[PDB]
Amino acid sequence: KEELNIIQGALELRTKTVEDVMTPLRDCFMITGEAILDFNTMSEIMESGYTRIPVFEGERSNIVDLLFVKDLAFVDPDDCTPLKTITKFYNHPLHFVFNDTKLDAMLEEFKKGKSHLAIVQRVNNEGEGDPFYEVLGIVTLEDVIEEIIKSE
Protein backbone atom coordinates (compact mmCIF):
# COMPACT_ATOMS: atom_id res chain seq x y z
CA LYS A 1 0.00 0.00 0.00
CA GLU A 2 1.13 3.50 -0.99
CA GLU A 3 -0.14 4.92 2.26
CA LEU A 4 2.00 2.75 4.54
CA ASN A 5 5.07 3.32 2.35
CA ILE A 6 4.62 7.04 2.71
CA ILE A 7 4.01 6.79 6.43
CA GLN A 8 7.12 4.78 7.06
CA GLY A 9 9.15 7.22 4.95
CA ALA A 10 7.64 10.02 6.90
CA LEU A 11 8.70 8.39 10.21
CA GLU A 12 12.29 8.03 8.99
CA LEU A 13 12.66 11.71 8.18
CA ARG A 14 13.48 12.31 11.89
CA THR A 15 16.62 10.13 11.84
CA LYS A 16 17.93 10.17 8.19
CA THR A 17 20.32 12.91 7.21
CA VAL A 18 20.90 14.94 4.04
CA GLU A 19 24.17 13.00 3.68
CA ASP A 20 22.21 9.76 3.42
CA VAL A 21 20.25 10.93 0.36
CA MET A 22 22.46 13.50 -1.29
CA THR A 23 23.95 13.22 -4.80
CA PRO A 24 27.62 13.06 -3.89
CA LEU A 25 29.96 15.46 -5.70
CA ARG A 26 31.43 12.75 -7.96
CA ASP A 27 27.93 11.98 -9.28
CA CYS A 28 27.09 15.71 -9.97
CA PHE A 29 26.90 17.24 -13.39
CA MET A 30 28.70 20.62 -12.87
CA ILE A 31 30.24 23.28 -14.96
CA THR A 32 33.45 25.35 -14.59
CA GLY A 33 32.99 29.11 -13.94
CA GLU A 34 35.39 29.66 -16.90
CA ALA A 35 32.94 28.19 -19.34
CA ILE A 36 31.75 29.96 -22.46
CA LEU A 37 28.07 29.57 -23.41
CA ASP A 38 28.71 28.76 -27.03
CA PHE A 39 26.49 26.36 -28.85
CA ASN A 40 28.16 23.09 -27.77
CA THR A 41 28.37 24.06 -24.16
CA MET A 42 24.65 25.07 -23.95
CA SER A 43 23.86 21.92 -25.90
CA GLU A 44 25.68 19.72 -23.23
CA ILE A 45 23.87 21.53 -20.45
CA MET A 46 20.44 20.96 -22.04
CA GLU A 47 21.29 17.32 -22.87
CA SER A 48 22.09 16.67 -19.18
CA GLY A 49 18.40 17.03 -18.31
CA TYR A 50 19.09 18.85 -14.99
CA THR A 51 17.21 21.99 -14.09
CA ARG A 52 20.12 23.43 -12.10
CA ILE A 53 23.90 22.90 -12.51
CA PRO A 54 26.44 23.83 -9.78
CA VAL A 55 29.25 26.12 -11.01
CA PHE A 56 32.76 25.56 -9.53
CA GLU A 57 36.03 27.47 -9.64
CA GLY A 58 39.32 25.63 -9.65
CA GLU A 59 38.24 22.46 -7.89
CA ARG A 60 34.78 20.71 -8.11
CA SER A 61 34.37 21.18 -4.34
CA ASN A 62 34.65 24.94 -4.67
CA ILE A 63 30.99 25.58 -5.70
CA VAL A 64 30.51 29.31 -6.22
CA ASP A 65 27.21 29.60 -8.17
CA LEU A 66 24.20 27.73 -9.55
CA LEU A 67 23.30 27.90 -13.25
CA PHE A 68 19.66 27.17 -14.11
CA VAL A 69 18.85 25.91 -17.57
CA LYS A 70 16.13 28.68 -17.81
CA ASP A 71 19.09 31.17 -17.53
CA LEU A 72 20.05 30.20 -21.10
CA ALA A 73 16.67 31.19 -22.55
CA PHE A 74 17.83 34.58 -23.94
CA VAL A 75 21.51 33.58 -24.55
CA ASP A 76 22.44 33.72 -28.23
CA PRO A 77 25.16 31.04 -28.66
CA ASP A 78 26.72 33.20 -31.45
CA ASP A 79 27.75 35.71 -28.76
CA CYS A 80 30.04 33.22 -26.92
CA THR A 81 28.92 34.86 -23.71
CA PRO A 82 31.02 33.85 -20.75
CA LEU A 83 29.08 31.96 -18.08
CA LYS A 84 30.30 34.56 -15.55
CA THR A 85 28.19 37.30 -17.31
CA ILE A 86 25.12 35.04 -16.76
CA THR A 87 25.81 34.11 -13.16
CA LYS A 88 26.58 37.74 -12.31
CA PHE A 89 23.22 38.76 -13.89
CA TYR A 90 20.87 36.23 -12.36
CA ASN A 91 22.83 35.67 -9.20
CA HIS A 92 20.77 32.66 -7.99
CA PRO A 93 21.17 32.22 -4.22
CA LEU A 94 23.44 29.35 -3.19
CA HIS A 95 22.30 27.56 -0.04
CA PHE A 96 24.49 25.34 2.15
CA VAL A 97 23.44 22.67 4.63
CA PHE A 98 25.41 20.52 7.10
CA ASN A 99 25.70 16.82 6.39
CA ASP A 100 24.17 15.85 9.72
CA THR A 101 20.98 17.89 9.01
CA LYS A 102 17.91 15.66 9.44
CA LEU A 103 15.55 15.28 6.51
CA ASP A 104 12.55 16.61 8.50
CA ALA A 105 14.41 19.87 9.01
CA MET A 106 15.59 19.86 5.44
CA LEU A 107 12.05 19.33 4.18
CA GLU A 108 10.89 22.19 6.41
CA GLU A 109 13.60 24.42 4.98
CA PHE A 110 12.79 23.54 1.31
CA LYS A 111 9.10 24.24 1.97
CA LYS A 112 9.87 27.79 3.06
CA GLY A 113 11.34 29.87 0.33
CA LYS A 114 11.89 29.17 -3.29
CA SER A 115 15.22 27.21 -3.14
CA HIS A 116 14.92 23.44 -3.51
CA LEU A 117 18.68 22.71 -3.79
CA ALA A 118 21.34 22.91 -1.03
CA ILE A 119 25.06 22.18 -1.15
CA VAL A 120 25.85 19.55 1.52
CA GLN A 121 29.03 20.19 3.50
CA ARG A 122 30.71 18.96 6.70
CA VAL A 123 33.15 20.53 9.18
CA ASN A 124 36.56 19.04 8.58
CA ASN A 125 38.34 19.09 12.02
CA GLU A 126 41.00 16.55 11.01
CA GLY A 127 43.63 19.31 10.42
CA GLU A 128 46.33 20.24 9.73
CA GLY A 129 45.45 23.31 11.88
CA ASP A 130 42.35 25.28 10.81
CA PRO A 131 38.90 23.64 10.66
CA PHE A 132 37.26 24.16 7.18
CA TYR A 133 33.96 23.35 5.33
CA GLU A 134 34.37 20.29 3.09
CA VAL A 135 31.70 20.13 0.23
CA LEU A 136 30.26 16.65 -0.13
CA GLY A 137 27.46 16.81 -2.71
CA ILE A 138 24.02 18.40 -3.30
CA VAL A 139 20.64 17.58 -1.98
CA THR A 140 17.31 18.71 -3.49
CA LEU A 141 13.65 18.45 -2.49
CA GLU A 142 13.31 15.50 -4.85
CA ASP A 143 15.96 13.52 -2.87
CA VAL A 144 13.77 13.97 0.21
CA ILE A 145 10.53 13.13 -1.60
CA GLU A 146 12.03 10.00 -3.03
CA GLU A 147 12.90 8.91 0.52
CA ILE A 148 9.27 9.53 1.58
CA ILE A 149 7.51 7.70 -1.33
CA LYS A 150 9.94 4.94 -2.36
CA SER A 151 8.96 1.31 -1.88
CA GLU A 152 10.52 -0.35 1.21
Ligand X SMILES: Nc1ncnc2c1ncn2[C@@H]1O[C@H](COP(=O)(O)OP(=O)(O)O)[C@@H](O)[C@H]1O
Closest distance to its own copies from the beta carbon of 7 (Å):
5
SS3 109: helix
Closer of 28 and 145 to its own copies (Cβ): 145
Peptide bond into 128 cis (omega under 30): yes
To ligand X, the closest distance from the beta carbon of 138 in angstroms equals 5
> By C-alpha distance, which of 48, 47, 53, 82 is closest to 66?
53
Comparing CA positions, the residue from 2, 69, 72, 59 lying closest to residue 33 is 59
Residues within the interface to its own copies (CB under 8 A): 2-3, 6-7, 9-11, 13-14, 39, 43-44, 46-47, 49, 51, 69-70, 72-74, 76, 104, 107-108, 111, 145, 148-149, 151
Please choose which of ligand X, its own copies, none residue 64 contacts, taking the beta carbon within 5 to 8 angstroms, the exact cut-off set by kind: none
Tell me which of ligand X, its own copies, none is bound by residue 19, counting a contact when its beta carbon lies within the kind-specific cut-off of 5 to 8 angstroms. Answer: none
Contacts of 32 (CB under 8 A, 6+ apart): 55, 56, 57
